[PDB]
């Protein structure tokens, strides 16, 4: 009675929609890491991250990792709608050795690495409205070159800025030209940032240098979806409750397995 315990060791693929991000994290699938290209525009009721997951692309550091991770988790969808920004005066589709797609240089499939064009990089100013009723999530980045010669050779600007503003929030990032530890043959880094454009709001990009432009918006979908870091196998069965240690019967009133439950689950009780 009371506590359930009695874990099974497997997560049932029914009735909830389960997605096994084998080798792939949600943030990695959101950005477009080459080994996660099979997750594009896919939905889920519960997304399971693995401890074996890794990143095999440009080195990124998300400042507020938990919130952006929790944002896409609740929507339960990676539906990406392409928009056509007028990036006039610059060159797009910048590739590097780290992000190798089909044995060829590439980049994040959801990002656009704007660089110099004809040795001229003007002050870009683009705006896109949220005419639609669903809130838009724009994912952008800021490149941190290794040396000043790189900052000049990519952007022809001694320094750059990136300002992403809305009716309610204005986000400004200033590049930090430094020599971070070498990862995948690169000493530079890129900082991922997010901005939600509510209906009736506009997105203002004021970037004067080192802009990792977004290729479109994502869909904030009202849903009961969420995520759970677990290394348990996803077996074929039906179980209404799900824990990181395996599916759990919801018949007993309380659970002592873990404070991480999804769906109709007995509330948690401590072990001791």
């Amino acid at each position: 009675e009371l506590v359930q315990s009695s874990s099974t060791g497997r997560i049932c693929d029914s009735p909830h929609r389960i997605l096994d991000g084998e080798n792939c994290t949600l943030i990695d699938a959101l950005l477009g890491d080459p080994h996660c290209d099979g997750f594009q525009n896919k939905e889920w009721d519960l997304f399971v991250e693995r401890s074996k997951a890794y990143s095999n692309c440009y080195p990124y550091d998300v400042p507020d990792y938990a919130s952006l991770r929790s944002l896409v988790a609740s929507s339960g969808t990676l539906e990406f709608n392409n928009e056509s920004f007028n990036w006039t005066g610059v060159a797009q589709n910048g590739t590097s050795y780290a992000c190798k797609r089909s044995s060829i240089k590439s980049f994040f499939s959801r990002l656009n690495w704007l660089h110099q064009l004809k040795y001229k990089y003007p002050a870009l100013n683009v705006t896109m409205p949220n005419n639609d009723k669903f809130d838009k999530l724009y994912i952008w980045g800021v490149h941190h070159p290794s040396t000043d010669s790189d900052q000049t050779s990519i952007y022809a600007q001694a320094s750059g800025r990136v300002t992403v503003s809305t009716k309610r929030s204005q986000q400004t990032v200033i590049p930090n030209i430094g020599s971070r530890p070498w990862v995948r043959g690169i000493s530079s880094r890129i900082s991922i940032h997010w901005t939600i454009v509510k209906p009736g709001d506009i997105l203002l990009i004021n970037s004067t240098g080192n802009l990792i432009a977004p290729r479109g918006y994502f869909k904030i979908r009202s849903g009961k979806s969420s995520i759970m870091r677990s290394d348990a196998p996803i077996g074929k069965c039906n179980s209404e409750c799900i824990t990181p240690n395996g599916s759990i019967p919801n018949d007993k009133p309380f659970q002592n397995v873990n404070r991480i439950t999804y769906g109709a689950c007995p509330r948690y009780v401590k072990q001791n």
């Epitope: 910048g94 590097s96 240089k105 010669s149 790189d150 000049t152 050779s153």
Partner: antibody, heavy 123, light 107 residues
């Protein structure tokens, strides 16, 4: 428009030092990476060296002890210096700019490439 | 050191035909090769960079391809103003050029 013009002699007797100056008009010389390339008669193109934005220089290993590429701000000129001139150095020398991004692995470009001071090495 | 060898040494093709120029390399290079056109008595002109990407002014008739060891350049509809010696260049750790292939339009 960034434009280049090679200025140099027409004959350099052997054992001397070749001096070639590349003057650039319509651009900033401290910015942009540059490189020197020579074309021996009927032999093809060969890389001499290159100076980058950082001022650091990199020369072809076969011709390191004799090559020196310098720049003179307040003159906006690129100076190539090839010591101990032999007749193998008889070529058409060219100064060119490169679109290199050292560090990010972006090696793509030759763009502006010059005119070509023909240098004959003989007594 | 990496060495580039172009084949064939000389191509003779009538106008409107298609040109195919190869640049086999000694070691793996990846998409780090560029093609150049040197008109007689003139400048080499950058045609293709990063094996496939075309530069400014370079029309669509020029189309390079390749990835490691073997790289090729394809000139569609050879026009009389294409007579030049074409070179391939690699650029990493050091700079190495090719032997050159002379294309001769045939009237």
């Amino acid at each position: 428009e960034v434009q280049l013009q090679e200025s140099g002699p027409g004959l350099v007797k052997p054992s001397e030092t070749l001096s070639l100056t590349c003057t650039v008009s319509g651009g900033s010389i401290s910015n942009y990476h540059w490189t020197w390339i020579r074309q021996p008669p009927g032999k093809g193109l060969e890389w001499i060296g290159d100076m980058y934005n950082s001022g650091s220089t990199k020369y072809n290993p076969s011709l390191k002890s004799r090559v020196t590429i310098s720049v003179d701000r307040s003159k906006n000129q690129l100076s190539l210096k090839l010591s101990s001139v032999t007749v193998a150095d008889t070529a058409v020398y060219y100064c060119a700019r490169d679109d290199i991004v050292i560090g990010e692995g972006w090696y793509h470009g030759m763009d502006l490439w010059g005119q070509g001071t023909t240098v004959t090495v003989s007594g | 050191e990496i060495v580039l060898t172009q084949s064939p040494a000389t191509l003779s093709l009538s106008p409107g035909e298609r040109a195919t120029l190869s640049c086999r390399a000694s070691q793996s290079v990846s998409t780090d090769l560029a093609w150049y056109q040197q008109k007689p008595g003139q400048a080499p002109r950058l045609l293709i960079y990063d094996a496939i990407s075309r530069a400014s002014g370079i029309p669509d008739r020029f189309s390079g391809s390749g990835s490691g060891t073997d790289f090729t350049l394809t000139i569609s509809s050879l026009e009389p103003e294409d007579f030049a010696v074409y070179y391939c260049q690699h650029r990493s750790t050091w700079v190495t050029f090719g032997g050159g292939t002379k294309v001769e339009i045939k009237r």
